[PDB]
Amino acid sequence: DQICIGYHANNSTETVDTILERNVTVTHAKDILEKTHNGKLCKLNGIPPLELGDCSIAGWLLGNPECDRLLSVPEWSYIMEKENPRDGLCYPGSFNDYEELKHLLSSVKHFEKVKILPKDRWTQHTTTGGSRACAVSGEPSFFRNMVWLTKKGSNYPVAKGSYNNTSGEQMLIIWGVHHPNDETEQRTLYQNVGTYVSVGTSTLNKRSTPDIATRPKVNGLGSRMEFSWTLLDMWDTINFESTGNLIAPEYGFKISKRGSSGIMKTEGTLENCETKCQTPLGAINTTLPFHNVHPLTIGECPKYVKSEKLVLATGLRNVPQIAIAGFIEGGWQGMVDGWYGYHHSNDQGSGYAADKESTQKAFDGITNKVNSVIEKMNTQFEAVGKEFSNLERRLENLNKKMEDGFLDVWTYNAELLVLMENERTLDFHDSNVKNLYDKVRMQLRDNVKELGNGCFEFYHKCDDECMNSVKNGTYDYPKYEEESKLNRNE
Amino acid sequence: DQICIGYHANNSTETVDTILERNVTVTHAKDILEKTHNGKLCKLNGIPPLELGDCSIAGWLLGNPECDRLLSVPEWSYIMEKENPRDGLCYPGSFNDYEELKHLLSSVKHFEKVKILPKDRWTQHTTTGGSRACAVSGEPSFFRNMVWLTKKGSNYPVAKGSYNNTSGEQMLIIWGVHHPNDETEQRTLYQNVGTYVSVGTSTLNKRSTPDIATRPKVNGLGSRMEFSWTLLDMWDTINFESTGNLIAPEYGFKISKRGSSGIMKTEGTLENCETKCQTPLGAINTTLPFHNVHPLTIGECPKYVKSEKLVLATGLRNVPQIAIAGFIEGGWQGMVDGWYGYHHSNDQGSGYAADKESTQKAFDGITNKVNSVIEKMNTQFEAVGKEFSNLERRLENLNKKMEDGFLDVWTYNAELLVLMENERTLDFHDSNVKNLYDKVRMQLRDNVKELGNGCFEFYHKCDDECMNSVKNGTYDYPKYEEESKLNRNE
Amino acid sequence: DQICIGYHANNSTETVDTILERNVTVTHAKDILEKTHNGKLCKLNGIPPLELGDCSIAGWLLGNPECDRLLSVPEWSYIMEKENPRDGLCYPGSFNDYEELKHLLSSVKHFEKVKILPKDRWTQHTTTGGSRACAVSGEPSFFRNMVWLTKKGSNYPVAKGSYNNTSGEQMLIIWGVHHPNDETEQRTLYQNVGTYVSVGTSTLNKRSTPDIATRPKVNGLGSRMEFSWTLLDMWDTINFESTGNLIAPEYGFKISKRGSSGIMKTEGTLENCETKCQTPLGAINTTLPFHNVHPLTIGECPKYVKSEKLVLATGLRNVPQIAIAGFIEGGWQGMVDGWYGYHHSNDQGSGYAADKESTQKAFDGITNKVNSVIEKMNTQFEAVGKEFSNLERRLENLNKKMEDGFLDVWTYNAELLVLMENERTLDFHDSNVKNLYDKVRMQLRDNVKELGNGCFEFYHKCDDECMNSVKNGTYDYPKYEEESKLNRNE
């Protein structure tokens, strides 16, 4: 008769990394890093994004004639913009606080265009001005959401306009100021020199004066146009007053829906698909705590790491070599129902077996460990992306260094955690096997003979019921004291 | 004769969490998180705070007529301000670089008011202006710390004034510019059109021109007042010059004391205590590495975590059940003098004991562990809290993201550290018990018989001195070697 | 005849720190923190720095007469500047966006000065102005890279100038505006009142008006000069137009070489030495992952921490005290071959030996642990250091807070890592020795008698070949079973 204690081995080729060893083959493993994507731009939670195409945000809001497909725009989940859009400001100029406007748009999901100043109200001025830069079918034209005021006859009276925000939400209003190239242009367009443009709300007070100077020609013109924006609160009034050089708004954008959104810089096209996580390269469908696809992401997505491999060991170490010995020589390829178990060879045949309580405890421990590593990570809606102007380099560097530092910290945390946990579980398995061996040895006492390979040779004749009692921890030592004593002394 | 090796158990119900198991009952535990406060706003280090009430910082510094109780304020530890103060700028207008001024006030603990420009020196102007917006008992009034200059007769001469900073410390000076509603108001107040206000120091050069336009009525007036502030260095001069629309200062604020302070947004009223860490909800009396009361604190306070439980295990696992058995079947409820011990049973009675060396070593190790966990955390006087305007949303988002990232980093660190250290301790105790058993077995050798439940049956007769020796570590094997061989063979 | 198992001891006094106990003496240890430096300012990768001396960046770029040595500066690796330089703006004034220019200079390694507007093209103006502030050898002078335009006779015509950037790279151009003290000075210099300065590029449009007011006297003058700068793109034009108060540039700075440089604030002088890492206190010459010299470094430098000691244990605990006993009583001073070994004593002699397999496994384990700790840290180039004005205190506080937080996080990480891995290394060594003892006992079975101090006593007579077989792992139990059974019973 004979009983042996050993562990389980299979044909797996999965390897993990520990703090003491590299490339350790294991029976089972779990990957906690996602490295794949579908390479497509899809809908987020069932709502399609807003595809700007070759247009810019300023061109969309101002009403560029080449962006006429965006006159009415439905609800969106995020905005897709090209890195260097072509159709922006057709008339050369600037746009004050552009990055602030984009950041505000990062948390707006829908707009509603409202006619706040009808074009026909300017009954004392000419409202049909145009330029060759914003030309449609050769003929000169202008922005579709703005009105250009010009003298009627040889008179430019004071232009006054007001609007009381009775819409129901905050309103975004954009106006502009014209900077001509020479005094002849100023006198031909506005008939007076020394003009002003005045805009004032309950919390805003701005006055601007045109600048007349020769400038390098952009898009064929030496003139410029400066645009400004404001947010009109509910039940608040905006006033306009100008003696010349005023580009007046005809529409105002009301914030109809609010939420978490962002601007994605991409050159692709929307495709028919759905997802819950979106990256500039493609969507992610995963349930793991890490990924290394792209730092910029929109939606509820796992943390981003600069790691090419993060594998948690779950099973034992694969050292399969092997009367039949025990755990000392190596693992077993015949035990296919548990991690740790027994092996017996008596008169009524032989065979393998598997201990239940120890395997259950080890399995529960490993499951708790992996769940604790996974669920201890906070996931929220992250839309990390910001634009800075050419005079805001220090702020941009600060933002970049902050993101880089946090990324490095989390990379170090994940790597060290996995490296140490793999070593601990590998030692845990050996400790469990040794504990089972010690328990069996203590329960058997002097009635058996050790062999040095994890196997015990019995002195008495142990049948199947006695082996079952041994495996279940119900061995009756007194029942075999007299029997085993005779052979031991002989 | 029996001598058993075991550990201590009690009737505790405290539970700790490890990385392999959850809700593990322990004999002793230590809490390293505090979740309680007294809910009272009250003194920091013996210095009462500055309670503004319904007044804002701008209203206090300018001298709003509704804040006359603040015209002479003593030392303070921190400033208490409401979220939306009611008595600020009685005259509608704006304040330039308001948030920078508040940040500067975050490091000032006392002000001294110095009369730098007496009201009676303006002998060629009228210095009794007022408005219905700032009215006391119905009659018009004005800010108590500034002078409104108006034409005398029908002339407004050029106004000049200067001050040389001979006070011994840095001084804060505030001036304002008036923006009328129409030309008639400008003519009846200053008699001139196209005026300027010039303020200049060694490192400052500012000139402003009033803007005349129709604006929505706030507090009944279409006019606005714009205020600016500067910091005048020691032995430096400030120059004022204006042809109209100048609100001139009468007082200056010199920084008498400097230190660490802050602005707390609460709606409560000062009460009586003597604390050292203040939160907007209440005070904290703690000696623990962490807390979860409120993020924004003033003083030296523990690190803030988004954790509801952080308990460190400092004792053994509580297995209640135990002739008398050993550590195989569980712990003892009758050994009340230590962690690891013995239990002997000879003809002269049977009682418990306690090994002192092992218990002392384990106690020292656990104490060093907890002190290493607690004492490596750096604590310092932190006054987190900053303010941003409507046109600085990117900066606000950057600040919030930085604070949140650091908070999650520390949360993960603390939770993982506690989870691992609990397993380390629970394995340490079992290893110590195993080592004690192994040492006793090795020094006893063949003279005893094992029983598999943790204790030994003696072959000779062991009196009290022999048990004292085996506990001591000076058991004499040759003394009983001949006697032991006699009964072992039989 | 007996054989013992023990470990290695020596005369070292190195000390390490663990999490359960402090001040542990180890046989071997590794220091991973450098605390030393040369104390000199040297050349980075063979390229000497730019020594500004008593000059500022503005003084060097504008051409202060005292800073006449920095007119043909060659390529540099980093810039050395003083905290309060003496030779800056000789004529009192300001410099708009000075900090942005200083930040841009941290990514430029060479400037080429090209003449864009020669001083002789101003045929209708006087270009020989000067002041007593910027005086050389008593006679008045001015900046060497700037031109002061004044009236010729009693006329100041419209001054126009332009330049097309055909140099081959981006250009840095600096201009200025003069602010006089009284109308008499303005009439004496420019003959016109109500002048302007206009500067325009493809993406820039600026207009300035002189300010005439009485100011405190700095350097003997009540007048100021305001300087501004731009970055001209390739194939772009800059236009200058002025009716007065224009300080036109004569040279433009071409970015000839771009890289990663920085500005170091020091009061020292350059010395003849080479280095790869530079700090304001000296140069670092290391391979270690950490240092604690100075937070601000330029080059490839280890991470900075606030620790005074970081030592990794790579050996055993030094407990030297010893028939010869084994590992129960202490280490051995005579077994200088490895870490773990045996001592044998038979009739053919006695001596010490070592087990090569276990020692090698432990050695590669410790080496792998050390390499894992050191190599996982990411290093790169970062010229840490930024400047902020007096109105940007919140931004400076944000930068300081972020840097301090990251430094604290990394210090905590390194300290806890060192403690836990030291503990695990000591436990590793103890477990290895115990495993060797268990292996020998298992292989030798009943032919030997245990003694309790790590030594076995053979029942048979074991010669040198049998001892070598025991060390080898090929001890033949049946070959000695018959003889060993005879002596044991008697």
Ligand SMILES: *[C@@H]1O[C@H](CO)[C@@H](O)[C@H](O)[C@H]1NC(C)=O
């Ligand atoms: C571990 O395996 C990887 C590939 O799986 C190999 O690149 C690396 O060199 C291996 N490491 C060692 C120490 O053999």
Ligand SMILES: *[C@@H]1O[C@H](CO)[C@@H](O)[C@H](O)[C@H]1NC(C)=O
């Ligand atoms: C704007 O409309 C609201 C609601 O009708 C009204 O209360 C408010 O007085 C209006 N504004 C003005 C300036 O009349």
Ligand SMILES: *[C@@H]1O[C@H](CO)[C@@H](O)[C@H](O)[C@H]1NC(C)=O
């Ligand atoms: C995403 O993965 C889940 C697996 O949990 C699967 O059920 C689902 O169909 C997948 N969806 C897509 C769009 O691939």
Ligand SMILES: *[C@@H]1O[C@H](CO)[C@@H](O)[C@H](O)[C@H]1NC(C)=O
């Ligand atoms: C263990 O299994 C044996 C099988 O022979 C059975 O007799 C015994 O009652 C079992 N004991 C327990 C506690 O399940």
Ligand SMILES: *[C@@H]1O[C@H](CO)[C@@H](O)[C@H](O)[C@H]1NC(C)=O
């Ligand atoms: C642990 O106990 C708490 C309450 O004491 C309970 O809320 C929680 O669900 C328990 N966890 C498990 C895994 O049983």
Ligand SMILES: *[C@@H]1O[C@H](CO)[C@@H](O)[C@H](O)[C@H]1NC(C)=O
């Ligand atoms: C201001 O006073 C100091 C000393 O009181 C003096 O040195 C300085 O010259 C004064 N300033 C002026 C402009 O006179």
Ligand SMILES: *[C@@H]1O[C@H](CO)[C@@H](O)[C@H](O)[C@H]1NC(C)=O
């Ligand atoms: C126990 O050991 C100590 C050694 O310090 C000795 O002084 C004492 O006498 C011993 N006690 C007994 C009962 O042997």
Ligand SMILES: *[C@@H]1O[C@H](CO)[C@@H](O)[C@H](O)[C@H]1NC(C)=O
């Ligand atoms: C330790 O012994 C070595 C001999 O190998 C000797 O060189 C060294 O000086 C000794 N150190 C001390 C502190 O005794």
Ligand SMILES: *[C@@H]1O[C@H](CO)[C@@H](O)[C@H](O)[C@H]1NC(C)=O
């Ligand atoms: C550890 O050794 C150092 C010597 O470098 C000593 O200063 C320190 O006090 C020691 N630790 C303790 C706890 O005494």
Ligand SMILES: *[C@@H]1O[C@H](CO)[C@@H](O)[C@H](O)[C@H]1NC(C)=O
């Ligand atoms: C500047 O020079 C480039 C070629 O070097 C030329 O193409 C461009 O037209 C020039 N600029 C102007 C305004 O003519």
Ligand SMILES: *[C@@H]1O[C@H](CO)[C@@H](O)[C@H](O)[C@H]1NC(C)=O
């Ligand atoms: C720097 O360290 C290296 C170590 O390899 C050494 O050879 C070299 O002389 C050192 N140089 C200086 C300047 O210390």
Ligand SMILES: *[C@@H]1O[C@H](CO)[C@@H](O)[C@H](O)[C@H]1NC(C)=O
């Ligand atoms: C010991 O093992 C080595 C294997 O490398 C073998 O060559 C040698 O003969 C063995 N010697 C003895 C005495 O077993």
